Amino acid sequence: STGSATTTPIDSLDDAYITPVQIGTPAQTLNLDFDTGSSDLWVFSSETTASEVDGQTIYTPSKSTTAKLLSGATWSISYGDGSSSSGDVYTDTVSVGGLTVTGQAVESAKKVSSSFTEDSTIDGLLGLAFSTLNTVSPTQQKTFFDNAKASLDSPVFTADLGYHAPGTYNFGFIDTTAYTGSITYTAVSTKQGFWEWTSTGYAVGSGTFKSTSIDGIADTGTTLLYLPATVVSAYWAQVSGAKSSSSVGGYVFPCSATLPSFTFGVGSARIVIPGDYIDFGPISTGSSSCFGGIQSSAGIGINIFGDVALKAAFVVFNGATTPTLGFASK
Ligand SMILES: O=C(CNCCc1c[nH]c2ccccc12)Nc1sc2c(c1C(=O)NCc1ccccc1)CCCC2
């Protein structure tokens, strides 16, 4: 089997991407944030505190003839940004672009934090990291991709995120028309449950490539690119007026700037992030100071190749016996 769905930025800045998912019988289509940085499939529901729901489409399990309460299961998750959600669990039928899983754990939210209530475009998350991270207790549940793996023509999914434009998630196959040149595959560690890999280095603009190991995670569920303080200082040094703001909590720069590109290494290969992709608009409406799309991973504990980096690449998440990650220019 295979599946193919379009993913769309939620706003003019690509702060996140949503992909339509069909849940239950008959189908309830909810728009989910496909997230390679977590492992819970959780949704706004008819069980969510009415004051924490504001425009999101809700999953109503009582209306699904295939939904079944998972007796005694609860879930509770907190991402390292403040946001969090929790609730109970159902198993139901879940389809993405023609690809169908029966008995997928669908984690119904009873409480969500502010960050999610505020984003009316996002009806939940579909986690695509490793099932070891799944928070359902007392019995861990499997991610959509894991449940689907055995059925796929190939145990893979690809992420093709667009810059200020629609993109594609495919399951089961690799679209050879979607990228230029060849796909460079690099090793993955699952020890922390992420698509964790090691970049061979970086360049700032047309500056000389620096070879250095940058261990980090391929994470579609994270907006920006978080890299070490040294690397990130080397980048913003090339932008006149750029500085790190405590009041803001990261590097900001003059909106009038023309940003240089950033290159990261995948083995001998190089992915080039156009300077464009690193601009995230005024820090507040009307301001001439703009938030940068590349930030320090200093108070995080791991580097994060978020959307800013992944959207410059065609990315293969290879769930074969030894998982690997693949990157191609596009
Ligand atoms: O958890 C994820 C991916 N999933 C994020 C889900 C999410 C949180 N808030 C949201 C708001 C809208 C849509 C989705 C989300 N990645 C991962 S993995 C990981 C972290 C994070 C993370 O929180 N990233 C986003 C972020 C990092 C730093 C500062 C601010 C934000 C930090 C500890 C090490 C391992």
PDB file of C-alpha atoms and ligand atoms in Angstrom, residues 10 15-17 33 35-38 42 77-84 113 115-116 119 122 124-125 133 192 194 217 219-224 226 296 299-304, ligand 1:
ATOM      1  CA  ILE A  10      -0.937  27.354   8.574  1.00  0.00           C
ATOM      2  CA  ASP A  15       5.020  28.494  11.524  1.00  0.00           C
ATOM      3  CA  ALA A  16       3.577  24.977  11.104  1.00  0.00           C
ATOM      4  CA  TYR A  17       2.109  22.599   8.513  1.00  0.00           C
ATOM      5  CA  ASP A  33       0.422  18.634  12.393  1.00  0.00           C
ATOM      6  CA  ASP A  35       5.378  15.697  13.755  1.00  0.00           C
ATOM      7  CA  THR A  36       8.569  13.662  13.417  1.00  0.00           C
ATOM      8  CA  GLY A  37       9.575  14.976  16.848  1.00  0.00           C
ATOM      9  CA  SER A  38       6.892  13.213  18.899  1.00  0.00           C
ATOM     10  CA  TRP A  42      -3.823  13.301  19.676  1.00  0.00           C
ATOM     11  CA  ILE A  77       2.377  15.071  27.036  1.00  0.00           C
ATOM     12  CA  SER A  78       4.552  18.166  27.421  1.00  0.00           C
ATOM     13  CA  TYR A  79       6.742  19.562  24.687  1.00  0.00           C
ATOM     14  CA  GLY A  80       9.854  21.498  25.651  1.00  0.00           C
ATOM     15  CA  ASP A  81       8.346  24.892  24.836  1.00  0.00           C
ATOM     16  CA  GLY A  82       5.668  25.068  27.497  1.00  0.00           C
ATOM     17  CA  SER A  83       2.773  23.558  25.582  1.00  0.00           C
ATOM     18  CA  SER A  84       1.069  20.345  26.668  1.00  0.00           C
ATOM     19  CA  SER A 113      -2.532  24.386  26.768  1.00  0.00           C
ATOM     20  CA  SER A 115      -0.409  27.495  22.437  1.00  0.00           C
ATOM     21  CA  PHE A 116      -2.842  24.984  20.915  1.00  0.00           C
ATOM     22  CA  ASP A 119      -3.838  27.969  16.829  1.00  0.00           C
ATOM     23  CA  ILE A 122      -4.402  22.878  14.016  1.00  0.00           C
ATOM     24  CA  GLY A 124      -4.079  17.969  16.652  1.00  0.00           C
ATOM     25  CA  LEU A 125      -0.748  16.219  16.120  1.00  0.00           C
ATOM     26  CA  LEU A 133       8.120   8.067  23.106  1.00  0.00           C
ATOM     27  CA  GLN A 192      16.334   8.931  22.371  1.00  0.00           C
ATOM     28  CA  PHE A 194      14.019  10.609  17.574  1.00  0.00           C
ATOM     29  CA  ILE A 217      17.052  15.547  15.217  1.00  0.00           C
ATOM     30  CA  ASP A 219      11.895  17.274  13.338  1.00  0.00           C
ATOM     31  CA  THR A 220       8.922  18.429  11.216  1.00  0.00           C
ATOM     32  CA  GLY A 221       7.094  19.364  14.422  1.00  0.00           C
ATOM     33  CA  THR A 222       9.492  22.218  15.167  1.00  0.00           C
ATOM     34  CA  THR A 223       9.315  25.536  13.301  1.00  0.00           C
ATOM     35  CA  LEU A 224      12.887  26.802  13.446  1.00  0.00           C
ATOM     36  CA  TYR A 226      18.208  25.209  16.447  1.00  0.00           C
ATOM     37  CA  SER A 296      20.698  28.712  19.635  1.00  0.00           C
ATOM     38  CA  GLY A 299      19.051  25.756  26.624  1.00  0.00           C
ATOM     39  CA  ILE A 300      17.539  22.802  24.781  1.00  0.00           C
ATOM     40  CA  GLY A 301      20.139  20.033  25.134  1.00  0.00           C
ATOM     41  CA  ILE A 302      19.913  18.881  21.536  1.00  0.00           C
ATOM     42  CA  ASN A 303      20.140  20.546  18.134  1.00  0.00           C
ATOM     43  CA  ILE A 304      16.909  20.596  16.114  1.00  0.00           C
TER      44      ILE A 304
HETATM   45  O1  LIG B   1       8.354  18.301  20.504  1.00  0.00           O
HETATM   46  C1  LIG B   1       8.847  18.484  19.405  1.00  0.00           C
HETATM   47  C2  LIG B   1       7.985  18.517  18.168  1.00  0.00           C
HETATM   48  N1  LIG B   1       6.597  18.751  18.528  1.00  0.00           N
HETATM   49  C3  LIG B   1       6.170  20.086  18.901  1.00  0.00           C
HETATM   50  C4  LIG B   1       4.672  20.104  19.133  1.00  0.00           C
HETATM   51  C5  LIG B   1       4.239  21.509  19.444  1.00  0.00           C
HETATM   52  C6  LIG B   1       4.579  22.263  20.565  1.00  0.00           C
HETATM   53  N2  LIG B   1       3.998  23.494  20.506  1.00  0.00           N
HETATM   54  C7  LIG B   1       3.269  23.590  19.370  1.00  0.00           C
HETATM   55  C8  LIG B   1       2.483  24.581  18.796  1.00  0.00           C
HETATM   56  C9  LIG B   1       1.853  24.314  17.577  1.00  0.00           C
HETATM   57  C10 LIG B   1       1.995  23.093  16.915  1.00  0.00           C
HETATM   58  C11 LIG B   1       2.779  22.072  17.442  1.00  0.00           C
HETATM   59  C12 LIG B   1       3.415  22.304  18.661  1.00  0.00           C
HETATM   60  N3  LIG B   1      10.145  18.676  19.220  1.00  0.00           N
HETATM   61  C13 LIG B   1      11.049  18.671  20.206  1.00  0.00           C
HETATM   62  S1  LIG B   1      12.075  17.497  20.640  1.00  0.00           S
HETATM   63  C14 LIG B   1      13.057  17.842  21.915  1.00  0.00           C
HETATM   64  C15 LIG B   1      12.562  19.250  22.198  1.00  0.00           C
HETATM   65  C16 LIG B   1      11.442  19.722  21.248  1.00  0.00           C
HETATM   66  C17 LIG B   1      10.609  20.964  21.066  1.00  0.00           C
HETATM   67  O2  LIG B   1       9.928  21.352  22.019  1.00  0.00           O
HETATM   68  N4  LIG B   1      10.694  21.638  19.918  1.00  0.00           N
HETATM   69  C18 LIG B   1       9.975  22.878  19.640  1.00  0.00           C
HETATM   70  C19 LIG B   1      10.668  24.019  20.373  1.00  0.00           C
HETATM   71  C20 LIG B   1      11.987  23.898  20.787  1.00  0.00           C
HETATM   72  C21 LIG B   1      12.605  24.960  21.445  1.00  0.00           C
HETATM   73  C22 LIG B   1      11.919  26.144  21.696  1.00  0.00           C
HETATM   74  C23 LIG B   1      10.605  26.282  21.272  1.00  0.00           C
HETATM   75  C24 LIG B   1       9.993  25.219  20.614  1.00  0.00           C
HETATM   76  C25 LIG B   1      13.368  19.790  23.386  1.00  0.00           C
HETATM   77  C26 LIG B   1      14.015  18.768  24.310  1.00  0.00           C
HETATM   78  C27 LIG B   1      14.932  17.843  23.535  1.00  0.00           C
HETATM   79  C28 LIG B   1      14.115  16.995  22.575  1.00  0.00           C
END
